[PDB]
Design a binder for this molecule. Structure first.
Ligand SMILES: Nc1ncnc2c1ncn2[C@@H]1O[C@H](COP(=O)(O)OP(=O)(O)OP(=O)(O)O)[C@@H](O)[C@H]1O
Ligand SMILES: Nc1ncnc2c1ncn2[C@@H]1O[C@H](COP(=O)(O)OP(=O)(O)OP(=O)(O)O)[C@@H](O)[C@H]1O
Ligand SMILES: Nc1ncnc2c1ncn2[C@@H]1O[C@H](COP(=O)(O)OP(=O)(O)OP(=O)(O)O)[C@@H](O)[C@H]1O
Ligand SMILES: [Mg+2]
Ligand SMILES: [Mg+2]
Ligand SMILES: [Mg+2]
Lengths: 523, 523, 523
């Protein structure tokens, strides 16, 4: 229809305003100081949102332009959020600062391209500085602190993460489940996880994560790849009597032949999942055997000459629940046999010793390791179910961040790294003045989030920022202490990766936002 | 219903205004200096457009008249864009200048017909001058520069094009694929391409290009033409078990008999493609054999007495993907057998040597050449998928332009050719004054785009244009240098063809636009 | 519902205004001087119309009354246009002048009936004068000029017509086809045309012309008339395998029996055409044989005892395309056999010589003549497809006009005949004064179109008209020359028929329009 066209700033302004609104809520929330926001819902009782991301998620802008601008930030932020596990807000905060300055520059009329380049250049420099700055992750006490940061002053989460982490081991994977009751429960789980993808996203379950969880899944394992439906079918027929959800393990399915027929021909209404059998070769078979024992189901192979058709439901094992993600597919708990599982482990363990070769040992050890498979399950209790879900989500985020953080190693929190890097960054100059300003802008952007925390403190961020900058080495302000001390000594460290991730995304967002000469919209 | 009728200028004005709006955005963008524009979308997050064409594409005018006028320019521009591969903006820019002047002339009330004729005459003269002006394409370094022009200061694209071009060879075809990852990958592809059309546009796939790509296509080759469905059918039945998309190679299908029955009788729901077998006669058979080996499928011929019905899926080969365009049909990668492919090539190669005759040698050599078939595949990485798509499109455009440019040979860029020609053109007179003015107008139009670049520079285009005109030979202004130097020496050259194409189209557009005595529209 | 009633002038005025609007656009366009008009379209990009008819066609009036009035003129004009092939505008121009005067007379309140009678009387007189005035058509150079007139200064069309005409021969029919490419191609076609009607308009194809064109038609010839479906059916069954469109040649079909069953019983969805076999008696058979040879199909006759059912598709010939019009049915190109066709021609030719009788000779010669059948095909190229269509239409119109013109013979163009006749006409008096005025009006009307051309010239038509009238013999003004010279000598001649046709229609229109005492419309 008729279009309303605006040029120049008009495009920017809408985005800017939208960004600010979203940013403002997020910024306040960010930092242990800040607090959450509330949203209405037509669907049901209104939703109250905490966590910076959630607040942003909740916030929608009536104005299309503003909303769209807001959306852009959010999407980037989420992406950073996923990878970092934390720092969603930080990216948002950074982006807002960058955008505003960039917009002003746009007002300046300096070509934004240089600025973007300068910003990117600055970002790269900052990243390098950060990496150098980053140091190894500290001990569990630090870990708890790391957890707390993700916690946003959720002491329990950090404690839980640390506790879970300790028992499982940092390396060991920890899984989160909804709490049985208000009190959290930490249980080591009997079961194994193997890294296998889901064949198709179609398989991917309802939840947003896209990990598929099956309730009481049935496990059919074929050492042989499941070439075609027909072999499968007689298994399926038993499955019809079944209907507890079916998980299928096959060495491989050729996508075209199976998928084409299956998808088009077959509705595939019945719940099914497919995963490639872990490992390859004998090891794969061995892994299958291990899985089979754990499942308590049996595996059918051509070599055995057992027929899939022949195999009944009984052959198929059952799992209490299975979760699958693209990276990995896990079975939370195969029913298994306690004796059987143990026996297999011992047998494998014996094998590990038996094999002279390291390689043989490794495969066996890996196999046993999986079978022993101490997976941590963490239950989060809550006063209410809703709370539990909220808590659980937070916990999960924290866990990821913590795990990443430990490996990456700690960097000073409080945006100390950001401020510190900026000073170094400032010296660096862009190719051209326009770039230079952008570079400066980026530096300014980095500084801001420190200020925000200070603002939450109510201390004047200027002094703090100045002081922070002045201090060499790792210098920072601890909100809780409200005292100056080494970040490391304080033990409050934000993950390198999260910081880096957020910054990069934020920078990207800002750059993208800046360059629009013109907008068109409908009237 | 009731009509709102306007006479004379009223018709023109709407078009003119519409043209200007579209043109303005395009003009600024054009040239390495310029920048892109943004568009909203109801469908999803708003679309931000760069590249002159895209900006134009994005821009829609609320006013029907204006929009229509804008559309007219765009359509012509695109046509020029396709052929030239570049210069979409240039044509638009040229058109706008011409149109405005023509409109003014219309205001003058001079009969536009003469003007159009004069313009056409001028265009022809200019074209001739350009052709003479044009010189052979320069080396790869120039090529990169050529690439950059298409790049619109996309250094990477030019580099990629040059790099791809070098390895493949200029003559060798280069294909672009989406990047696997952010980093670009250049891989020579194993596979052959043969120039065959698609039997029907119906076959033509979803994408706008209309080239059809099949995922994991199955290749059925019959040396014999596939007369009727019935012979095909048993192949199809196997195909039913199949469903990875089927590509059919047949010597010929008589359109009426097969098509009539097939289309009407048969939904043709299942994905299928048909291509004529390459070559004719023994050579065709030989080509088929080469294809068959590459595919790894087998070919069935009456002479063999193999039956299509008899032939199973296995006989049909598979391709990783196939792309078909009207001009040519290619298989990106037949699974083939590495040994088999090599062996065939050697055998053919031996044949080439064996044949005394040049003709025999040529056919064989062509066959081997296809089999060796170093096709370049270029993967474009991107920060985001969206970016990659955008980049890829740009890359593709650049590649076409570069290829065309090299063969055509370089002409001075910067609209140097255009300005230069105009001066010569000016001397030429139209038959009548009205024609004369039109001729002058065309000349003026040519000059303008040089100015636009200058304007982007911010230098006063008048001086530059004057200076450029003054210089004899190839004289031009390099935006980047902002120094006067030989265009050739500078090595920044716009393709002759692109320039010529754009000019002709623009002229055509302008002429068309000019002549409307009256408009009618609904109220 | 409620009606808005107007009496007297109110009815007229709407029509008059509508007429003027349509007329004005047309008048300007008419004459080589004039230019075309543009129209919008919701459907797609707006349609730009040239050619007087098209402009009129495009122009629609919002007002119902005006529109209706406009429509009336157009419809008559088109009718004249078809017959004349040219002079669509002229009729319109004439009508407008007549109508206005008549309306004024209506204002006068003189009974329009007399005026109409007077006008008719004047027209008749004028016609007689014109006929006497008309002279034989001139040579090809004139023909080109004739072509140009239809051309409306389309030099190419005239040239093409002349060129086509020369090769084909004036007598020989010329057919127009869309150009293969921009360059026109003139090819003599191998094929025969026979004058046969289409049995039913139902058969009549989609296009407005109503001529039916079949793509790759199949030709079934029965010497015997195709009495019933049943005999046909087995042919049809083969046809089902077919589906390239089927053309049927039968001696006769009794309408009721076949049609009733066929239409009602049978959807007749499958494309089919029926034509009566050319000629009757042995000659008809002979013609069929000639057709059959040309088609390459075979004919089945009862005498032969061949069965239609028995006859397969193979027996049926195929044609590249067939065009059928009510007057005649032609096959553009039967596949035929080159040798076969030639042989038949020779055989017939021998027969022609062989037959002593003129009658026998004539039939044979006609048969051979058809087989030799040099039909001219003219391809019109265009810059764009749209242009080509437009050009083609113009070309076709020109061809008809030219052919008619040549036979009729030339009359002075420029409305010279019209002006000349009027003077003579003026002397003639109507029965009564009211008639007299009408007669004068008609005379005035004739004069006007000369003026319009002059107006386009910008010369004052009064002087020209006066001068033209003054000159005895053929005196006229040549727009291009802008010099006075003999029309014949100038060689610019408008066809007698076209002029006569247009005048008569215009007069009819004017008369019809004039007499409405009252109008009623809805509110
Ligand atoms: N006591 C503290 N002293 C200094 N800064 C602190 C302290 N506790 C936390 N912070 C800082 O506050 C930020 C963590 O808060 P938060 O997790 O809300 O930010 P975020 O991760 O960007 O937002 P979200 O978690 O909603 O994505 C980090 O920069 C962290 O170092
Ligand atoms: N350094 C330079 N000096 C002079 N002119 C330059 C320079 N770099 C590019 N140009 C000119 O700018 C134009 C190329 O820009 P662009 O590709 O945007 O124009 P376009 O092809 O008409 O637009 P589009 O590519 O959007 O169709 C050419 O005329 C080219 O010669
Ligand atoms: N050089 C000329 N000198 C005099 N009159 C001319 C000349 N060329 C063409 N004409 C006249 O102009 C008229 C032909 O133009 P045109 O074909 O547009 O009129 P039309 O046939 O009535 O309109 P249309 O072709 O749209 O129906 C004729 O009367 C013809 O004699
Ligand atoms: Mg956080
Ligand atoms: Mg370009
Ligand atoms: Mg005409």
């Amino acid at each position: 229809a008729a279009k309303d066209v605006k040029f120049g700033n008009d495009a920017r302004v809408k985005m800017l305003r939208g960004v600010n609104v979203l940013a403002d809520a997020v910024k306040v929330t960010l930092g242990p100081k800040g607090r959450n926001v509330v949203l209405d819902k037509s669907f049901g009782a209104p939703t109250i949102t905490k966590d910076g991301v959630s607040v942003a998620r909740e916030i929608e802008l009536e104005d299309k332009f503003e909303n769209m601008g807001a959306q852009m930030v959010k999407e980037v932020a989420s992406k950073a959020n996923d990878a970092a596990g934390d720092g969603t807000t930080t990216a948002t905060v950074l982006a807002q600062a960058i955008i505003t300055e960039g917009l002003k520059a746009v007002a300046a009329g300096m070509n934004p391209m240089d600025l973007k380049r300068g910003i990117d250049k600055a970002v790269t420099a900052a990243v390098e500085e950060l990496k150098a700055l980053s140091v190894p992750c500290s001990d569990s006490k630090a870990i708890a602190q790391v957890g707390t940061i993700s916690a946003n002053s959720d002491e329990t989460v950090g404690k839980l993460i640390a506790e879970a982490m300790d028992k499982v081991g940092k390396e060991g994977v920890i899984t989160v489940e909804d709490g049985t009751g208000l009190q959290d429960e930490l249980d080591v789980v009997e079961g194994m996880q193997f890294d296998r993808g889901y064949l198709s996203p179609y398989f991917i379950n309802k939840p947003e994560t896209g990990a598929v969880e099956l309730e009481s899944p049935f496990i059919l394992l074929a050492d042989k790849k499941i070439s075609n439906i027909r072999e499968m079918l007689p298994v399926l027929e038993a499955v019809a009597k079944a209907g507890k959800p079916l998980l299928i393990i096959a060495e491989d399915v050729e996508g075209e032949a199976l998928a084409t027929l299956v998808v088009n021909t077959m509705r595939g209404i019945v719940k099914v999942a497919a995963v490639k059998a872990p490992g390859f070769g004998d090891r794969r078979k061995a892994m299958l055997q291990d899985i089979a024992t754990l499942t308590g189901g049996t595996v059918i192979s051509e070599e055995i000459g057992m027929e899939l058709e022949k195999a009944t439901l009984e052959d198929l094992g059952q799992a209490k629940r299975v979760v699958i993600n693209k990276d990995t597919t896990t079975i939370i708990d195969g029913v298994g046999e306690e004796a059987a599982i143990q026996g297999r482990v011992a047998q494998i363990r014996q094998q590990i010793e038996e094999a002279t070769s390291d390689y043989d040992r490794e495969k066996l050890q890996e196999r046993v390791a999986k079978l022993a498979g101490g997976v941590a399950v963490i239950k989060v209790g809550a006063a209410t179910e809703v709370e539990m879900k909220e808590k659980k989500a937070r916990v999960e985020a924290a866990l990821h961040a913590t795990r990443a953080a430990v490996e990456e190693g700690v960097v000073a929190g409080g945006g100390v790294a950001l401020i510190r890097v900026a000073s170094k960054l400032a010296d660096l100059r862009g190719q051209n003045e326009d770039q230079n300003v952008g570079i400066k802008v980026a530096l300014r952007a980095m500084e801001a989030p420190l200020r925000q925390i200070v603002l939450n403190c109510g201390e004047e961020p200027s002094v703090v920022a100045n002081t922070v900058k002045g201090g060499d080495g790792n210098y920072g302000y601890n909100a809780a202490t409200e005292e100056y001390g080494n970040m490391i000594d304080m033990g409050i460290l934000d993950p390198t990766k999260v910081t880096r991730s957020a910054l990069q995304y934020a920078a990207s967002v800002a750059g993208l936002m800046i360059t629009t000469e013109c907008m068109v919209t409908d009237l």
